[PDB]
Amino acid sequence: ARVTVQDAVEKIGNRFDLVLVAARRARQMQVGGKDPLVPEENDKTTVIALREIEEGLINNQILDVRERQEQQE
């Protein structure tokens, strides 16, 4: 359901941190359960993650926050 990554870069300047962030999130949403944060479209984890990103609510900050939190828990 996704054709480009432009707004993704717009939300994260590196364009590579983009990559790694997406990847971490993706491994989560494929192995670590933890259902996504957006109506899926039979799309794979990958696109799911990029879409979560351009919904401006997932990044490296949020990730490490939630990891530390769940780890405390």
Add this chain to the structure above:
Amino acid sequence: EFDAIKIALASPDMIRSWSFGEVKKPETINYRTFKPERDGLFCARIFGPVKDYECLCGKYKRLKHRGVICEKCGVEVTQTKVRRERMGHIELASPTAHIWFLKSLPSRIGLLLDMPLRDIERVLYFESYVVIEGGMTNLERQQILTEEQYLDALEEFGDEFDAKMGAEAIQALLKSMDLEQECEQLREELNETNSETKRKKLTKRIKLLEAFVQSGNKPEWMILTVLPVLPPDLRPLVPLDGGRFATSDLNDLYRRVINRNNRLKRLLDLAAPDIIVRNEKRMLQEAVDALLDNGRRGRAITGSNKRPLKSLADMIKGKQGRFRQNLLGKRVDYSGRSVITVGPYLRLHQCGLPKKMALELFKPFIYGKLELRGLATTIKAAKKMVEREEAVVWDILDEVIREHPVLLNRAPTLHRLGIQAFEPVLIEGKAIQLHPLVCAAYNADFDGDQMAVHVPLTLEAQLEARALMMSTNNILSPANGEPIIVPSQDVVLGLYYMTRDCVNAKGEGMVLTGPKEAERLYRSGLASLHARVKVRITEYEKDANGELVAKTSLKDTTVGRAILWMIVPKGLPYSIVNQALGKKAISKMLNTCYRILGLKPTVIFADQIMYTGFAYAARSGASVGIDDMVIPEKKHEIISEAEAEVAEIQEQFQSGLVTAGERYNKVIDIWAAANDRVSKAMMDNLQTETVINRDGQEEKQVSFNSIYMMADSGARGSAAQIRQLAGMRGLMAKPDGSIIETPITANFREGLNVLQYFISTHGARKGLADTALKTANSGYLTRRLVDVAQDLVVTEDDCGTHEGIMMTPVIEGGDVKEPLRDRVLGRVTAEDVLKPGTADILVPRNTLLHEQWCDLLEENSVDAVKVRSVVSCDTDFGVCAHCYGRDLARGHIINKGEAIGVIAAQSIGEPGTQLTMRTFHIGGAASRAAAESSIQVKNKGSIKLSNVKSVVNSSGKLVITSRNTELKLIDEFGRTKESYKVPYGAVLAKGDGEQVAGGETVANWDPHTMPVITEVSGFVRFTDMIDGQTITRQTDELTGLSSLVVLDSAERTAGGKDLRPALKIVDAQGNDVLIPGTDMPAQYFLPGKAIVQLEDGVQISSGDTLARIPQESGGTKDITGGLPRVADLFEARRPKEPAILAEISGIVSFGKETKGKRRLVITPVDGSDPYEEMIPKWRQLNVFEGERVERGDVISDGPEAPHDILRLRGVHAVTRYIVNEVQDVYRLQGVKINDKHIEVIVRQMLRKATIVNAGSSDFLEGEQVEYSRVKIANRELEANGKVGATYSRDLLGITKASLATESFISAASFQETTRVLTEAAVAGKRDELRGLKENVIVGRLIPAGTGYAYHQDRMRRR
């Protein structure tokens, strides 16, 4: 797991520690059974089992019994991997020279020993003898002797003597040599001696030695005592289909070595005679030599029938060694390849893929989803499922594909585009469908080209593709700013036909509200496609701060044009498409569309472009027929007239009015003129012939002849090609590069007569053949460049410095060639540029320069800008961001780590193909002759004169008597732009302070004569002239006149050979003309070998040239051109006849004019002047004794030596020189290449340096090491109180900077192996990775991108 790789020599005991036994029997296998022979190359109890966890005797076929060795056959039991890990050795019963250390040029052994390699050889292969501590004798230690010499010596000294011959000898030599007395004595020798080659040899020696001692090594180790053997697997005995075995060469080599060693063993115990044992040892040494490097020592030994068998060296080096064969690239699973086609129904973010092909590709994923849905318990069952190819399978396949990008590649993978990605859509057939646009990016027509596909297997990589490889994300080549989604032939023909007015057609000039209803008319056919028409339209201009204002209005346009308009995205202005939409047009169209509305709309717009294009193109049907190429009626007439002209010139020749040479030349020129006339005729009668009524009477208009359409479109072909279809095809050139005196009369429509076609044949075959060799040499260039930059990545954010280079736009006096805008764009300020209004901040000092600031500059018309460049960033082990500027394809600044190295490399490379092979380079020579004749000022400004001592001529003009005049061009502010030299006594067409415009000539003179200009007026006598004796009278036929040639000493008559003739201006009767202001008359003494025309008794005006001096000149740069010129630049080949420059600045003077390179002394204004320099007198000069010149200034004339440039002018200077030259080449062929790339190349081109003073350092003085290392060192060292070091950057050609790099494995993997590995091995050069090629080899991540994040985290952790 690990880190930096270490390398060193081989201690015999270290080897023993490696091995697990020693072969003794040369036999390979049983080949009666297939069991390996005991204690041989394949022996288990040395090496190990055949099949996993199975003894040879057949004892323990059981994991439970692992670990323990046998006792019957006595063999360990494990995985067969051990059969690969282990290694074996051989106790050679005699020492052996290691041929690498023996023959590398230089021989490490030799230099260590100070001995001619030839004689060291003569030692090794046993035809000599060498002393070993002979004692109180008449003989020297290193001394060597022959047979009879040795025998007489033996009889001269029976026992106390000591010498030997061969391996043992060399070994004892080295073991005897102490490595500290050497340091002492040789440093003393360098201190004392003076000879230059001595210095160089001795310094190489001392380098070798001090390094060797710094390591923990031992020289004798250079001699092998226990030669290891390769593990067996890697030399496997291939069982061919038959009772034979196509043995690997390694096997046979080891076999020979073993037989040899065994005969040697069996001999010694039997005390066989010395001649025999010598022959034995000799064969042994040669065999070991073969083992290591067959083919390096004399005749190689062959293998099967006649071809030299492969060796270990071979297995490393060469195009097909391990490096170039399996590590810098390799074969790869999960892939495929096919032929390609078009399928224009594909939103370019996708591409075709063959169904069968896919189903075979993703089989893993298939099995996965299969047993997820649970349709097969075991994997095997699913394998059967896929093979049966049942229904459910395909649905699952679609499922797994739906969003999983794949990679496409073409073969000639030239540049970054060369691999892209898509999302497949599954198609019938068996080929790959591929979007049309992306063709040109692939440089890939559909002539049958094969493309390959890869599939990322992992999730991260799926992201990789979708982020950095999905053609969407590449509209711009990182090479240069042009778009790369340019439409092409079909689609553009379409649009052309789709927007072009005729004068009169169905639906003429009606009115239409909605482009919708326009398309309605067209589909109805109730109104012609292209027709003049008034229509309402609506457009959107977004002047507001990110907000779109809608307006709407009526337009006088064409129906189809609107119909196109219904697809323009909401943004652009309407006027973009009012015109005819040529290729260039639609190019700008798409491009502006991008730059104004971002990316997503751009791509969707591109695909809509293609759709609508193909559509109306077909709907039109632009065919081509023979009648569609009109032969110009006047063609027959014109060529007949030309024939008559040829006859006229032929009559002139036959009547002897001209020689065959100018005959040839006249004929060719007149044919050329005729050709051009014909071209004009045909182009006219095509482009305009369409002439039709209008509801009036007539009118001419642009045509519709499909061929002219296809051209003016810009689809393919142009005036040129349509010419070679209709008019004559001009002239053709024989292989001589000459050009035949009879052109092609006819064209392709008519038939060529044989001889013509035959000529044009070789005419074209020349280039058609050229392209091959061209491709080859180009590729070599590319590779070399990549391995000079494979280890440079932007790492830190901001160096934070205040250095850089200047930029001025190049001008030919009139218009500018390089718009400073288009040279600076994308790069970043160095200082703050002051307003033209002096002392006013126009732009900040450390900020980007994008298009709007460029426009501001243009508005303010800035002369030059100081700007940062990668050349000199202060980064360590990398390059700071802001110094690199806009990564193209991404308007914003570079991202933290996108490794510019490789992209720059490619970008330089790719145009390779597109150069020419072999011509003469011209660039600097053009302006060269220009400035010779007369001065050319650049721009508008006033005039300033330095050292102006002159005199007004009779005409009122001015000519200069001071030999030191400088011309300064004044701006509208008060500084100076140009400071030109001034030849002596030039005809000044101007004067000081005169406000003149840009691009004008101000002076004039004979470019090749030292004038003898007067000083006063009055009559002329032969004052001091010696008649006949010194002078000579020379009557010249062609000029029908004589003159007075001034003969120099060796040429004038000997009588008064020292009597000097002169000339003094006199009054009306011969008295002295005292110079106004001085007391001496104006006598001028005449230098020899000159020419004088005027004779005695002539009135002359103040400021007249008297005599002339023939000034020799030669500009033979005739080894220069194109691709090889690029090569030689990045190579820094000292050109054939360099031009010398000023060592230091100051006053100059002559010296003792010894024949040959006479002398030239220099002296600083105050500093010491210990310097002189000898210069070949036969070479011309550009200076005189009284001159005072700047350092690094031109002295001789000719090509400009990069090395001396560096060591004199400056880094900025040299990088500017390189970039100007290379840009000149590529422009002379016209391929836009942003400078940044060449810049970074140069940066690597100077990554080493040498020393002058260590101060408090950790460095030997006469030493070479990278710039970065010393800079980081002395940085902290100066941070402490102690004093730093003095260095000197030294430029290296790429094919060198490669070699001496910090790392080695790269070099090892570049252009040669043995040299590098050996020098390392003696260096003990412990080596980190810190580099792409390195990690590629070891296969961990790459510190480039994503991997740059990885390495940052890791280095942070430790």
Add this chain to the structure above:
Amino acid sequence: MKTPLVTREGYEKLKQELNYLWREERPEVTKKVTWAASLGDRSENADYQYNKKRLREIDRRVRYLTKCMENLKIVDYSPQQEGKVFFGAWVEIENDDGVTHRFRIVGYDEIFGRKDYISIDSPMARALLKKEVGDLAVVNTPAGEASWYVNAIEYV
């Protein structure tokens, strides 16, 4: 097989063509080939072919005229030494049949219908070299020998 003698006006014209090409036509064709090679990049592309061929020709000619500007020797002499017809002379010659023939003699690199189109290294010239108003000039064309009478000598 060559003679560097040059007339002033011709040298001027040489500089003129040099600038015209290396300053105007070269940059035009430059822009042209650039736009043509905006990633067209086809060896078969005969547009690119012909364009680069014009490049090759203009380059050959510029190098030729460059070497010329280097070597060529100017003699722009006055009408002072007259009578002899050594060079740079408007000359008429006549034949038995009365073949009037007028021309000025200039340097090899000036042979055009522009001003005056007779060489100096030509055999005719070689004969004409040093003669007077009434001499009997003879040459030996590859068709044989022939002769003419001088009728005019003029300078400028």
Add this chain to the structure above:
Amino acid sequence: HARSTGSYSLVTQQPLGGKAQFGGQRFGEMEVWALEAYGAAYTLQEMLTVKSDDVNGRTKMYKNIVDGNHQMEPGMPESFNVLLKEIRSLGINIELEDE
């Protein structure tokens, strides 16, 4: 012609070349250059480590695939290991180190 997972050469545990031999494509030096030019890293690391060289990791990959765990573990390129043993056969010592 295509290939997923088939034979493997014997000297170097690498895929074979050609169609007749049921082998796969060749990712070439220039293509390595290319991927390097793109920031794409995991791509090339996967495409040199898993897809070719380690038998161990190759198997790990194939299994993890069949369980959807899109993942990889590099290990070491067995070919480079071969280079090591080869140079070591030459009179040169070469080693890895600690970390």
Add this chain to the structure above:
RNA sequence: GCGAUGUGUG
């Protein structure tokens, strides 16, 4: 289940 040489394709 290797390497040589050749032919052809881009």
Add this chain to the structure above:
DNA sequence: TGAATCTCTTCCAGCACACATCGGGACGTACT
């Protein structure tokens, strides 16, 4: 005497395919 200028001789010449052939002979025997 020694710093320049010839002159043998090692090293490299694009990428990716496809297909094809061919791969020791020689010298001498205990037998087959």
Add this chain to the structure above:
DNA sequence: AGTACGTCCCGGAAGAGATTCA
């Protein structure tokens, strides 16, 4: 009878002569 099994094997560029202004 005749042999399948034995051994047996053009450009560059940089170095070491080598030649010539001292």
